[PDB]
Amino acid sequence: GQLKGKIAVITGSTQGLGAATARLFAERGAQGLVICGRSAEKGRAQAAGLEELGAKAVFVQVDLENVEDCRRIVAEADRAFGRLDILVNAAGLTDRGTILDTSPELFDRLFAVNTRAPFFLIQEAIKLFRRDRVEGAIVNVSSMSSMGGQPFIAAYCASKGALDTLTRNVAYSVLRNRIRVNSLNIGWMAFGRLLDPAKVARAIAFLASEESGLMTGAIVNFDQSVWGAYDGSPHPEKPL
């Protein structure tokens, strides 16, 4: 019942968190889902799975580094369903590198998928929300690393900090539109365990649904850790 009648785009949805999210959305009555990713086969398999749960599903084969592919995703929601209600930016790359050895190519892929793709998916979703007078809801999946984070993922952490800033900027800009933009800042996914995507999906659904009311611009930490809290202040064992 919770997402009855709703049309959603969810990225990173051929597997992992995006697929878990799409499955939950269908289980909760989503009318139409646009899913996307690189693998045609996994995409086709997920779409048929979503249909058996009750959602019309469209799969879009994409490379999120390509801004035109980003635009096509949202175009496909309009093509198939004529409207959009929800965008969930759940795709992400987690390529590693330190400040010393990260290549420009690696830096650029991280920003392209983790920051630029959300930017242009958000751009397109808000154009549909405005056209059809929809109180849209956007959920960005960011990271616990977004404040500063770990030396082995320098560029990755920066790409997520950019996303948090963007979440707040966009939320502010569309306040009077009643378009809501919130972030869920997650730990590492599958005591201490890797996070369960099915439970993460539940938090996303909250933020994507009427249950979170007017909430917008929130940065919601989701992890068994707490920014600025510790037993002793963290520091490296060795010089870099």
Question: What is the residue range of 227's domain?
Answer: 1-240
Q: Establish whether the linkage from the previous residue to 192 is cis, with ω within 30° of 0.
A: yes
Identify whether 172 is a catalytic site residue.
no
Give the total number of structural domains in the chain: 1
- Choosing from 137, 156, 157, 180, the catalytic residue is 156
Residue 146 · residue 118 · CB < 8 Å:
no
Residue 19 · residue 44 · CB < 8 Å:
no
Nearest Cα to Cα of residue 169 among 216, 112, 204: 216
Record the resolution, in angstroms: 1.8
Q: How far apart are CA 118 and CA 162, in angstroms?
A: 11
Q: How far apart are CA 47 and CA 81, in angstroms?
A: 15
Q: How far apart are CA 113 and CA 127, in angstroms?
A: 21
**Three-state DSSP class for residue 32:** strand
End-to-end CA separation in angstroms for the chain: 52
Residues in the chain: 240
Counting Cβ atoms within 10 Å, is residue 47 exposed (0-12), middle (13-18) or buried (19+)? buried
- CATH code: domain of residue 190: 3.40.50.720
